Amino acid sequence: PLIVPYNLPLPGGVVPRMLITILGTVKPNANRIALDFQRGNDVAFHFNPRFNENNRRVIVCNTKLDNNWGREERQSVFPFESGKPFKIQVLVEPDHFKVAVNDAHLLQYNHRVKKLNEISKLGISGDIDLTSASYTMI
Ligand SMILES: O=C([C@@H]1O[C@H](CO)[C@H](O)[C@H](n2cc(-c3cc(F)c(F)c(F)c3)nn2)[C@H]1O)N(CCO)C1CC1
């Protein structure tokens, strides 16, 4: 187990068939979680479960370029629960990030940042206890 926030190094960036697994438990009174795949100061892929946005649960995904957030992609499907252990898996494909939570497909996010081999850090933050963060090649 690790104390958030935590940065997982992705040396030489990401590549298709790279599978990132994040294990943790959502805190009992959680408001938000974020994964940030970073290319320097840019955020290639921000994955942001929000537990109370206007009293609704939503997944917000976005990219940050030159310190500006772009067009949000939102999902109503919300697989997380306060207090409960989770597994987030991010599969890097040639054209998108694929996300599954607790072994169920959640969403895919088209690559806006094209230089996958420069996406060299994964930031993990928010209202979780972080158990582990690792990757393998499938
Ligand atoms: O609220 C936002 C921003 O939306 C952006 C995506 O469009 C980011 O989510 C921004 N964000 C979240 C976090 C964050 C999240 C966590 F879970 C953390 F634990 C943590 F430490 C930080 N850091 N930046 C967010 O301020 N907006 C209003 C409409 O959605 C958009 C900008 C117009």
mmCIF file of C-alpha atoms and ligand atoms in Angstrom:
data_model
loop_
_atom_site.group_PDB
_atom_site.id
_atom_site.type_symbol
_atom_site.label_atom_id
_atom_site.label_comp_id
_atom_site.label_asym_id
_atom_site.label_seq_id
_atom_site.Cartn_x
_atom_site.Cartn_y
_atom_site.Cartn_z
ATOM 1 C CA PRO A 1 0.000 0.000 0.000
ATOM 2 C CA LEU A 2 0.952 3.567 -0.910
ATOM 3 C CA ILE A 3 -0.145 7.044 0.212
ATOM 4 C CA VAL A 4 -1.870 9.126 -2.473
ATOM 5 C CA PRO A 5 -1.044 11.153 -4.385
ATOM 6 C CA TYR A 6 1.260 8.694 -6.155
ATOM 7 C CA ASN A 7 3.099 8.946 -9.477
ATOM 8 C CA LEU A 8 3.730 5.662 -11.287
ATOM 9 C CA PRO A 9 6.681 6.029 -13.739
ATOM 10 C CA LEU A 10 5.959 4.903 -17.293
ATOM 11 C CA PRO A 11 9.538 4.856 -18.722
ATOM 12 C CA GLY A 12 9.587 5.460 -22.481
ATOM 13 C CA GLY A 13 5.845 6.116 -22.299
ATOM 14 C CA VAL A 14 3.003 3.726 -23.080
ATOM 15 C CA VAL A 15 2.635 1.249 -25.929
ATOM 16 C CA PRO A 16 -0.219 -0.932 -27.305
ATOM 17 C CA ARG A 17 -0.858 -4.089 -25.262
ATOM 18 C CA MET A 18 0.360 -2.359 -22.083
ATOM 19 C CA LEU A 19 -2.113 -3.125 -19.271
ATOM 20 C CA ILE A 20 -2.061 -0.877 -16.196
ATOM 21 C CA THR A 21 -3.759 -2.197 -13.039
ATOM 22 C CA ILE A 22 -4.678 0.051 -10.105
ATOM 23 C CA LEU A 23 -5.951 -1.647 -6.933
ATOM 24 C CA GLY A 24 -7.385 0.243 -3.983
ATOM 25 C CA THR A 25 -10.388 0.907 -1.763
ATOM 26 C CA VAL A 26 -12.660 3.940 -2.161
ATOM 27 C CA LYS A 27 -12.847 5.972 1.056
ATOM 28 C CA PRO A 28 -16.228 5.894 2.898
ATOM 29 C CA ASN A 29 -17.096 9.522 2.157
ATOM 30 C CA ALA A 30 -15.472 9.784 -1.260
ATOM 31 C CA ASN A 31 -16.047 12.784 -3.551
ATOM 32 C CA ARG A 32 -13.594 12.171 -6.414
ATOM 33 C CA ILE A 33 -10.885 9.960 -7.918
ATOM 34 C CA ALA A 34 -8.434 10.840 -10.700
ATOM 35 C CA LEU A 35 -5.977 9.036 -12.941
ATOM 36 C CA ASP A 36 -3.710 11.388 -14.922
ATOM 37 C CA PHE A 37 -1.625 10.021 -17.796
ATOM 38 C CA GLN A 38 0.910 12.809 -18.270
ATOM 39 C CA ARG A 39 3.145 13.974 -21.096
ATOM 40 C CA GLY A 40 5.194 16.561 -19.226
ATOM 41 C CA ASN A 41 2.686 19.218 -18.101
ATOM 42 C CA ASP A 42 0.080 17.909 -20.569
ATOM 43 C CA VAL A 43 -2.504 15.374 -19.433
ATOM 44 C CA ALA A 44 -3.034 12.881 -22.243
ATOM 45 C CA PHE A 45 -5.853 11.113 -20.393
ATOM 46 C CA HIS A 46 -7.630 12.316 -17.250
ATOM 47 C CA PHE A 47 -10.068 9.732 -15.847
ATOM 48 C CA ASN A 48 -12.145 11.388 -13.137
ATOM 49 C CA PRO A 49 -15.001 9.600 -11.273
ATOM 50 C CA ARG A 50 -17.099 12.208 -9.451
ATOM 51 C CA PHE A 51 -19.408 10.934 -6.713
ATOM 52 C CA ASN A 52 -21.370 14.165 -6.208
ATOM 53 C CA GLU A 53 -21.483 16.441 -9.210
ATOM 54 C CA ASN A 54 -24.834 18.216 -8.828
ATOM 55 C CA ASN A 55 -25.902 15.262 -6.642
ATOM 56 C CA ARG A 56 -25.132 12.765 -9.435
ATOM 57 C CA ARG A 57 -22.375 10.207 -10.024
ATOM 58 C CA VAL A 58 -20.519 10.640 -13.317
ATOM 59 C CA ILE A 59 -17.262 9.715 -15.034
ATOM 60 C CA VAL A 60 -15.490 12.696 -16.620
ATOM 61 C CA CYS A 61 -12.648 12.105 -19.095
ATOM 62 C CA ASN A 62 -10.533 14.825 -20.713
ATOM 63 C CA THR A 63 -7.130 15.967 -21.987
ATOM 64 C CA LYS A 64 -5.126 19.002 -20.827
ATOM 65 C CA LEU A 65 -2.956 20.781 -23.418
ATOM 66 C CA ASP A 66 -0.879 23.893 -22.658
ATOM 67 C CA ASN A 67 -2.567 24.021 -19.244
ATOM 68 C CA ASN A 68 -6.076 24.127 -20.791
ATOM 69 C CA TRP A 69 -8.716 21.408 -20.448
ATOM 70 C CA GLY A 70 -10.402 20.328 -23.678
ATOM 71 C CA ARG A 71 -13.774 18.783 -24.544
ATOM 72 C CA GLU A 72 -15.100 16.502 -21.789
ATOM 73 C CA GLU A 73 -16.287 12.977 -22.556
ATOM 74 C CA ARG A 74 -18.828 11.956 -19.897
ATOM 75 C CA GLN A 75 -20.242 8.544 -18.925
ATOM 76 C CA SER A 76 -23.261 7.951 -16.668
ATOM 77 C CA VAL A 77 -22.188 4.350 -16.024
ATOM 78 C CA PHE A 78 -20.610 4.486 -12.574
ATOM 79 C CA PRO A 79 -19.119 1.214 -11.237
ATOM 80 C CA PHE A 80 -17.576 2.558 -8.020
ATOM 81 C CA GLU A 81 -19.040 2.599 -4.524
ATOM 82 C CA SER A 82 -17.853 4.443 -1.422
ATOM 83 C CA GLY A 83 -16.042 2.150 1.009
ATOM 84 C CA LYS A 84 -15.494 -0.670 -1.520
ATOM 85 C CA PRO A 85 -12.341 -2.276 -2.995
ATOM 86 C CA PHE A 86 -11.873 -1.633 -6.723
ATOM 87 C CA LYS A 87 -9.666 -2.579 -9.635
ATOM 88 C CA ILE A 88 -9.146 -0.117 -12.494
ATOM 89 C CA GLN A 89 -7.456 -1.551 -15.572
ATOM 90 C CA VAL A 90 -6.309 0.683 -18.406
ATOM 91 C CA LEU A 91 -5.409 -1.159 -21.598
ATOM 92 C CA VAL A 92 -3.411 0.879 -24.087
ATOM 93 C CA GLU A 93 -4.621 0.160 -27.626
ATOM 94 C CA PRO A 94 -3.314 1.698 -30.903
ATOM 95 C CA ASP A 95 -6.170 4.222 -31.132
ATOM 96 C CA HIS A 96 -7.547 4.513 -27.591
ATOM 97 C CA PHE A 97 -7.243 3.845 -23.898
ATOM 98 C CA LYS A 98 -9.671 1.111 -22.818
ATOM 99 C CA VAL A 99 -10.884 1.148 -19.201
ATOM 100 C CA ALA A 100 -12.428 -1.735 -17.273
ATOM 101 C CA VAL A 101 -13.444 -1.586 -13.607
ATOM 102 C CA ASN A 102 -13.839 -4.765 -11.538
ATOM 103 C CA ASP A 103 -13.408 -6.806 -14.765
ATOM 104 C CA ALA A 104 -16.263 -5.018 -16.583
ATOM 105 C CA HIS A 105 -15.649 -2.841 -19.648
ATOM 106 C CA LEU A 106 -16.390 0.805 -18.822
ATOM 107 C CA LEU A 107 -15.233 3.088 -21.645
ATOM 108 C CA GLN A 108 -12.715 3.834 -24.371
ATOM 109 C CA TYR A 109 -10.990 7.185 -24.898
ATOM 110 C CA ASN A 110 -9.502 8.066 -28.290
ATOM 111 C CA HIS A 111 -5.880 9.241 -28.203
ATOM 112 C CA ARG A 112 -5.752 13.029 -28.559
ATOM 113 C CA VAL A 113 -2.080 13.082 -27.534
ATOM 114 C CA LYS A 114 -0.363 11.091 -30.286
ATOM 115 C CA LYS A 115 3.102 10.629 -28.745
ATOM 116 C CA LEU A 116 2.364 7.542 -26.635
ATOM 117 C CA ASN A 117 6.079 7.004 -25.968
ATOM 118 C CA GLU A 118 6.202 10.394 -24.195
ATOM 119 C CA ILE A 119 3.301 9.669 -21.805
ATOM 120 C CA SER A 120 5.791 8.875 -19.087
ATOM 121 C CA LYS A 121 3.933 9.239 -15.762
ATOM 122 C CA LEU A 122 0.621 8.135 -14.262
ATOM 123 C CA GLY A 123 -0.659 10.272 -11.389
ATOM 124 C CA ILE A 124 -3.143 8.634 -9.006
ATOM 125 C CA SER A 125 -5.089 10.936 -6.680
ATOM 126 C CA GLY A 126 -8.335 11.431 -4.780
ATOM 127 C CA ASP A 127 -10.401 9.726 -2.122
ATOM 128 C CA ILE A 128 -8.883 6.237 -2.130
ATOM 129 C CA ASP A 129 -6.577 3.952 -0.241
ATOM 130 C CA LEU A 130 -4.052 2.820 -2.855
ATOM 131 C CA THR A 131 -3.066 -0.849 -2.560
ATOM 132 C CA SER A 132 -0.926 -1.158 -5.699
ATOM 133 C CA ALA A 133 -0.190 0.244 -9.149
ATOM 134 C CA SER A 134 1.632 -1.824 -11.768
ATOM 135 C CA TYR A 135 1.577 -2.852 -15.419
ATOM 136 C CA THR A 136 2.362 -5.774 -17.702
ATOM 137 C CA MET A 137 2.265 -6.508 -21.434
ATOM 138 C CA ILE A 138 -0.641 -8.691 -22.611
HETATM 139 O O1 LIG B 1 -14.231 20.705 -12.655
HETATM 140 C C1 LIG B 1 -13.740 20.985 -13.724
HETATM 141 C C2 LIG B 1 -12.378 20.496 -14.087
HETATM 142 O O2 LIG B 1 -12.585 19.458 -15.036
HETATM 143 C C3 LIG B 1 -11.386 18.894 -15.539
HETATM 144 C C4 LIG B 1 -11.744 17.879 -16.607
HETATM 145 O O3 LIG B 1 -12.499 18.519 -17.625
HETATM 146 C C5 LIG B 1 -10.622 18.262 -14.397
HETATM 147 O O4 LIG B 1 -11.405 17.212 -13.821
HETATM 148 C C6 LIG B 1 -10.314 19.306 -13.338
HETATM 149 N N1 LIG B 1 -9.603 18.658 -12.217
HETATM 150 C C7 LIG B 1 -9.931 17.711 -11.362
HETATM 151 C C8 LIG B 1 -8.829 17.539 -10.570
HETATM 152 C C9 LIG B 1 -8.654 16.564 -9.468
HETATM 153 C C10 LIG B 1 -9.492 15.462 -9.365
HETATM 154 C C11 LIG B 1 -9.289 14.543 -8.349
HETATM 155 F F1 LIG B 1 -10.108 13.441 -8.227
HETATM 156 C C12 LIG B 1 -8.253 14.732 -7.457
HETATM 157 F F2 LIG B 1 -8.045 13.828 -6.437
HETATM 158 C C13 LIG B 1 -7.407 15.818 -7.567
HETATM 159 F F3 LIG B 1 -6.372 15.973 -6.663
HETATM 160 C C14 LIG B 1 -7.603 16.741 -8.573
HETATM 161 N N2 LIG B 1 -7.887 18.395 -11.022
HETATM 162 N N3 LIG B 1 -8.378 19.065 -12.032
HETATM 163 C C15 LIG B 1 -11.594 19.974 -12.882
HETATM 164 O O5 LIG B 1 -11.273 21.063 -12.002
HETATM 165 N N4 LIG B 1 -14.452 21.712 -14.737
HETATM 166 C C16 LIG B 1 -15.879 22.027 -14.637
HETATM 167 C C17 LIG B 1 -16.657 21.126 -15.595
HETATM 168 O O6 LIG B 1 -16.305 19.748 -15.376
HETATM 169 C C18 LIG B 1 -13.934 21.842 -16.105
HETATM 170 C C19 LIG B 1 -12.736 22.763 -16.358
HETATM 171 C C20 LIG B 1 -14.111 23.182 -16.822
#
